Amino acid sequence: SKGEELFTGVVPILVELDGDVNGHKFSVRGEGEGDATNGKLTLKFICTTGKLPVPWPTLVTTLVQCFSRYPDHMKRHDFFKSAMPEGYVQERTISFKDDGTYKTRAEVKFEGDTLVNRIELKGIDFKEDGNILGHKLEYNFNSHNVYITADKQKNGIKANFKIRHNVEDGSVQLADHYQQNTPIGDGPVLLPDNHYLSTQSVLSKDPNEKRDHMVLLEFVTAAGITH
16 A cells, blocks of 8 residues: 555654543654664653552553554555555454453544554543552563454454463453444555454563553564465
């Protein structure tokens, strides 16, 4: 696409999230850059409202799949880049087993020469001393495949996947993801055959940043179609 050629270089990324979970409102602001050619990106996020009322790992999937490395033999199946620069809306339901639910609406688009992910997040019916609101999750992240299928009737795609969050006691907190994406603009986009993205996320801290924050390195690649 014309859209994919916008990602040949190193693209600045701005992430802005406004959140409201069980009436706890918060905001997050991330800045970094993405290298789609190689399928890696680096971001640093600050909670600008003080202490984050949920664990950072529970926000990772919400906080730019346009930066995936698609292999040349799969380029015809990159919806995310095809929708650029005007971008796409991305919506999820994230259902935390035996706990509450996030509902997210994001717009991913270029503002000037920056790729911006603007998100609204509403979380309902969380337990005040469960794993999320009690901050009982480990500050780490497992690798996962996101299985993507076309949604022809919406000129977009959908995806389903389970995220497994390690709990401090060694148990596992599941977060079932249901995702849908739709072009912001009108213009044609690539509607893909079934395939998946493989993602690895690496979380760290900056000892010199007193604000509640998350340093993040992500690898993302596409697979599952064979020329």
